[PDB]
Symmetry: C2
């Protein structure tokens, strides 16, 4: 049959490509979630959070979705909302890019601009204000804590890795934003397939809150350029129990790495993709991981060389 | 196994999505070549033209690729060249967008800027000049006439349509730039699978050179905004013998249609996608095509709502 009823259903079955200038004897393979509706991993959780809300009764015909993300999740939710016919409001700082404004508005989003000076705090507060005004009408899917986030990764992303590696995957390397990808993928491979792999979270050296937490050191978030990761706290959808190792990468190296993916491998991937690869490459060049297959999530694609 | 040796190999197996606000009782299904390396159909011919040149001996290690396209084919060739380790020169008018300049340079292209005032004529002439200077060194793959163009479409795109429609496809609708997609797809379904479908070329009303030619009318190309199609002549890779029908669409409607794909279906597709859909919708709403499955190629994706 092989026909999809709407674009939300077309998520996943992402590539898997072997790198020739990273790792050791091609030990590093990279996913390419860029190959998705909306061109990011977030298409997966955008789909499943909506689907789950439907099954659960929390989202019905007539209720409206409100979230404050103006990142890849917004575009995911925007596409899904268009595909499934829901009104969405997204709240943004007024100082967000016209490109993203135009894109979200083009997708049929009711865009609500908040005070530049209040930043993301402003947008989040206003989203909660809107919901408070009529809860029976508005639904916020809360990506940092919604279980349907890691669940989609356990049911799709993880099995796809297992399947396309003939169960040979030894290591999974994934930057943490909401923590959903690493969490769901790890549960799939470790619990459902029963292979005791090494799960590796990646985070900015500028904001190493996972490493600080685990080291029992003071948590000290910080500014960084690795868009998509390093939220500055531990999300509820990051399952600390399934993480084996945490690697930090700096913004500069992440940027250089993303450039090399493009110029040396011909893969057009976002800064966070560069962060994850830089981390994977470092472990791939330890003798202990010489005979091991390392799979790296490239969360997004870049429509613009960060140059 | 399911691991790719480089990004050139990962082409194709594109979606297939059913539209809810076009056609009649979901008779229109849309491909989504946007789901490709470089985010366009051109990834297919970028891959195969290089591969074929390798097999044929025309492209070896050390020879360099030169083409004048600064459109989707360039990005395809740029990605393939990066993935396979070839030098590429692309010639462009000096007045091309910084975004595309930055993107191509980011992919490792040797970018050669030609006189704004000479336009595409300038860039094409300069590419030929470069080849003339050392033929033993430079290879121009010539997308309008290179057989490896429609060949890839016959071996992949076409079979994918056949396969994902359980052989139920009745009509194929495709805008013509080089003519490769319509040609290769039609040969596959008509000659290899033996189903006598209706093959429909689409072209701008502003530059209806296929329709003028077939009507024995004077060929009169013209300016238009439907980026990717209506080259203003009959390419050698457009096989007139496999075309059943030619539909014209205007730039305005193409633009409106691409907007509706985004807002009503949640599919982010280029202006040419809008052109092809507008044409498909019109035929889909004839009683004669009421019980027929119409498959439309969406050649590209748009990173920017044309708004």
């Amino acid at each position: 049959m092989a026909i999809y009823a709407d674009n939300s259903y077309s998520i996943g079955n992402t590539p898997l490509v072997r790198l020739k200038h990273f790792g050791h004897n091609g030990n590093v393979v990279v996913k390419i979630e860029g190959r998705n509706p909306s061109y990011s991993v977030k298409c997966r959780i955008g789909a499943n959070m909506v689907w789950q809300a439907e099954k659960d009764g929390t989202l019905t015909k007539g209720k409206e979705i409100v979230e404050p993300t103006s990142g890849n999740t917004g575009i995911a939710l925007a596409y899904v909302a268009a595909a499934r016919g829901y009104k969405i409001t997204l709240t943004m700082p007024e100082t967000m890019s016209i490109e993203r404004k135009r894109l979200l508005c083009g997708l049929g989003v009711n865009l609500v601009l908040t005070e530049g000076a209040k930043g993301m705090k402003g947008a989040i507060a206003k989203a909660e204000e809107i919901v408070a005004s009529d809860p029976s009408r508005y639904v916020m899917l809360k990506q940092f804590e919604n279980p349907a986030n890691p669940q989609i990764h356990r049911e799709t992303t993880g099995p796809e890795i297992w399947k396309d590696t003939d169960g040979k995957v030894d290591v999974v390397v994934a930057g943490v934003g909401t923590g959903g990808s690493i969490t769901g993928i790890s549960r799939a491979i470790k619990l459902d397939f029963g292979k005791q792999i090494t799960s590796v979270a990646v985070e900015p050296v500028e904001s190493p809150v996972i490493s600080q937490t685990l080291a029992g050191e003071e948590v000290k978030p910080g500014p960084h350029k690795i868009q998509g990761i390093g939220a500055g706290f531990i999300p509820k959808n990051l399952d600390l129990s399934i993480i084996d190792r945490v690697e930090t990468v700096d913004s500069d190296t992440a940027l250089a790495t993303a450039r090399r993916l493009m110029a040396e491998e011909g893969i057009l991937a976002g800064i966070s993709s560069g962060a994850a690869v830089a981390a994977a490459d470092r472990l791939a060049k330890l003798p202990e991981f010489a005979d091991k297959l390392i799979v790296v999530i490239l969360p997004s694609s870049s429509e613009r060389y960060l140059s």
